Amino acid sequence: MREIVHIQAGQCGNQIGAKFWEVISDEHGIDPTGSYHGDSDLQLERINVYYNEATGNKYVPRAILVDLEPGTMDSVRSGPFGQIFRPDNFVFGQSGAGNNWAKGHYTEGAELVDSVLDVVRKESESCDCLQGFQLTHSLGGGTGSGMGTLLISKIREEYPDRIMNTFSVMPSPKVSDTVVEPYNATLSVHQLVENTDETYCIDNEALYDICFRTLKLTTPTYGDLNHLVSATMSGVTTCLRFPGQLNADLRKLAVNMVPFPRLHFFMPGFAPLLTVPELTQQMFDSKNMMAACDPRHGRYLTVAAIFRGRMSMKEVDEQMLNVQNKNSSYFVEWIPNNVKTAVCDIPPRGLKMSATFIGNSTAIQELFKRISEQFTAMFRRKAFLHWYTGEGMDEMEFTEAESNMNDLVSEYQQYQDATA
Amino acid sequence: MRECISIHVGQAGVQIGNACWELYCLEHGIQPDGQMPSDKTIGGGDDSFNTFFSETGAGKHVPRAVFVDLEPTVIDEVRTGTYRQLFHPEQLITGKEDAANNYARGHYTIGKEIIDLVLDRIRKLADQCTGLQGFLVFHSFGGGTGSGFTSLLMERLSVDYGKKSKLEFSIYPAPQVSTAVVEPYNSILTTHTTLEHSDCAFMVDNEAIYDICRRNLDIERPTYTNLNRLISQIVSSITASLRFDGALNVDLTEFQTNLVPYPRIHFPLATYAPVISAEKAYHEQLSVAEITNACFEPANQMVKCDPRHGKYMACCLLYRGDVVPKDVNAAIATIKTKRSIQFVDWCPTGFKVGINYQPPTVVPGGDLAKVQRAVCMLSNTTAIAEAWARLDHKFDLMYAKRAFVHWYVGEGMEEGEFSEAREDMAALEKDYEEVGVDSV
Amino acid sequence: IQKAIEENNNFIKMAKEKLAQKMESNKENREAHLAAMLERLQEKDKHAEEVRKNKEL
Ligand SMILES: Nc1nc2c(ncn2[C@@H]2O[C@H](COP(=O)(O)OP(=O)(O)OP(=O)(O)O)[C@@H](O)[C@H]2O)c(=O)[nH]1
Ligand SMILES: Nc1nc2c(ncn2[C@@H]2O[C@H](COP(=O)(O)OP(=O)(O)O)[C@@H](O)[C@H]2O)c(=O)[nH]1
Ligand code: BEF
Ligand SMILES: [Ca+2]
Ligand SMILES: [Mg+2]
Ligand SMILES: [Mg+2]
């Protein structure tokens, strides 16, 4: 298993997708012309996971760019590495959902889904061994939220035995003031819970709290938030892109990280935001989490730790055992050896050492609890529905999405209270 | 004749096969291109090393081996490594998508697509044998291929070759180098379905080898290369009786008669000495008595367990190098009067001794020192059931909550297979208690 | 010697049949697993066609 097909949908999906392709491109020594100019053969070892080999030794991202608004078409191509994307993998509309989940999932989104699916198949047809899909998108918008989930369920029909990965950005009143975001988020997780295998919860409330309180940014940009997303997106995919033993492909990660098919929502962490002891405890700290969840308010089902840079593996092994035994109360005992660690020699650009954390923690319920609380504060009033009922939807979909997300929470709590 | 065919399954099995065949080539004077200038009979012959190496007209000595993995990564290194000329390409079988640490994928979904090709290539090795003795299967307990595909393979070999002997070298999982949380599952599953089809299984606890490398060889953080070069020495001691001769050489099958009192009780404990660095071996070579004493130090065992708290049903000593029976008997007498070796009351207490005079060799750039004499002890002790108990407990912790079980049901398996495999292990743990109680 | 032959042959026979059943039973379970998730995905398409047509009315 080698090739991953990447999809970016919506404003956020295309933005965080661009800076993801920018970072790993620098790590793999690839300029915007698709030419290789690195000095370690370990950069070309698994280049096929994310890059096709074109004519003349040029590397083209296996990326598909989607948006119902033709705004982002310019921005991507105008931004760095805009040419690197193949022109035909650009599929766009003219009128977007306007932050309406229904428009992106059932009407204007369903009118465009056949177009992107055609690009998915050609990109998948020439895969030696298609490994799976990863989607970048927001859950509080229209296209990435509504049409992203529809695209997942459509790809899953044609590839039911492949891994479906998503980098789902969650809404937060601290970043966006759009009122219909708790609606779009709940309807999305209702779909993600059923049709995806792995979901990295990139919580915007977390990203801002770090930029404001940690990095000391009064009015941080979307770029300041996205520099965090790019840092972690590179971290969680390190084991996929470089020769390694642990979680080297999406399925092995899934088997290691997901004990119950619905509890597949991960709490990513990153450090720094330097010695191995400090990297470890910071990596396990609440402030370094990219989801607004205190891991010590719940329990860990599984954890994947990734250290990058030149360092003593003996020290890493000792510190990972040290943090586990000193915090044993936060690791369910009915899953032995549920913390796995990987070390990559090459570090991310700008740092000597770094640590990326992927945690399946029952504390993620705090994130879903906050959304459902903001959801029920508008559903109890029956507010702003005509933007959704006017597109053909009924109350059944809203109440069913509400019930399913609250079920996810109680299931995370059911295994938090489980004993031996 | 009495040829022996080796089958290496999955990453661990393949990478251990690399270390073993390299060591074999060094021990027999075989060059990376297969040439052996000492072999004066070209194209054939019935020498002792021909149990493991066939011969071509061009003078190439070819391992009687098959390398199979459901992913090309690990075997590709064989195709381009130092010994790429040693194997004909038909011996290195690869798929394109591995089992992803899932027993179900290795035994069913993916494994069933390549099993017929593997058996066909094994058949072509068997066809060159004038008196095939049996198979040596190297695999991990925890990997999806090493567990699922091995058991599928072992089942098919029982059909295609009857009760032709099948021996295992099994890698028992350890958290220091483990790669999957579900390794307890794959271990119980593969042990249950293989138990009927295996005549003798040498378990190698990765944590035991890991500790030996850290403790005895100044390796702060042992890698698979450190572990596999130590494992190959043990495998070499065991197969040395088949690949060499000598007036005092005792055939492995003769040890096997003493080691397997009942079909299911076929898991010998291996302990190897001396594991010593060149810096410490310099100007100090260990006598026969010293390496024999080390065989009863639990820290030198291949599986973590306490034989002092169990009973012995057999004790075999496989000596290698400069060793004469006089020193052996003296060392055994010292031990029998200074160690805690209790036997079950239904089997004799004599130690079975074998000596191959061909001295052990080291792989260049290795860690262990070149010693004049080495010894591997094979003992059938009830204490090895401790290794089952540790695995069965981890299995129970996860299975009580059905954790990760959906990954197996999704591939076609049923919960019944989990409980059926677990109770086979429960009965196996119980079988080891029964053989230890005294007669009445 | 005829009993030894009968024993080995019966060991081969029953091993061949238990494996045949397992490989057939495993295929039926995996297919039913996939058949279930696809029939549940098409019902999302029936609900989608029913939604986009309910807009007109
Ligand atoms: N001693 C030793 N153990 C190994 C080696 N390689 C892997 N292992 C162990 O094997 C177990 C995992 O099985 P693998 O062999 O890596 O995987 P596999 O058999 O190829 O199965 P899949 O990858 O899922 O298809 C873990 O417990 C590892 O620690 C090795 O080279 N030497
Ligand atoms: N972190 C981050 N969040 C974003 C970005 N752009 C939009 N968002 C979030 O996404 C939500 C709006 O969704 P949007 O991207 O407009 O959906 P679209 O209609 O499919 O493009 C809001 O909650 C924003 O906070 C970005 O560049 N970075
Ligand atoms: F801005 Be999105 F298309 F709703
Ligand atoms: Ca010859
Ligand atoms: Mg937009
Ligand atoms: Mg493998």
CSV table of C-alpha atoms and ligand atoms in Angstrom, one decimal, chain B residues 39-47 49-50 55 61, ligand 4:
chain,number,residue,atom,x,y,z
B,39,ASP,CA,33.0,-28.1,-2.3
B,40,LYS,CA,34.8,-30.3,-4.8
B,41,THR,CA,31.7,-32.0,-6.1
B,42,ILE,CA,29.9,-29.7,-8.6
B,43,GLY,CA,26.2,-29.6,-9.2
B,44,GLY,CA,25.3,-32.0,-6.4
B,45,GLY,CA,26.6,-34.2,-3.6
B,46,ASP,CA,25.1,-35.5,-0.3
B,47,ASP,CA,27.3,-33.5,2.2
B,49,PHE,CA,25.4,-28.8,4.3
B,50,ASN,CA,23.3,-30.1,1.4
B,55,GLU,CA,23.7,-27.0,-5.9
B,61,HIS,CA,24.9,-23.2,-3.6
D,4,CA,CA,28.8,-30.6,-3.8
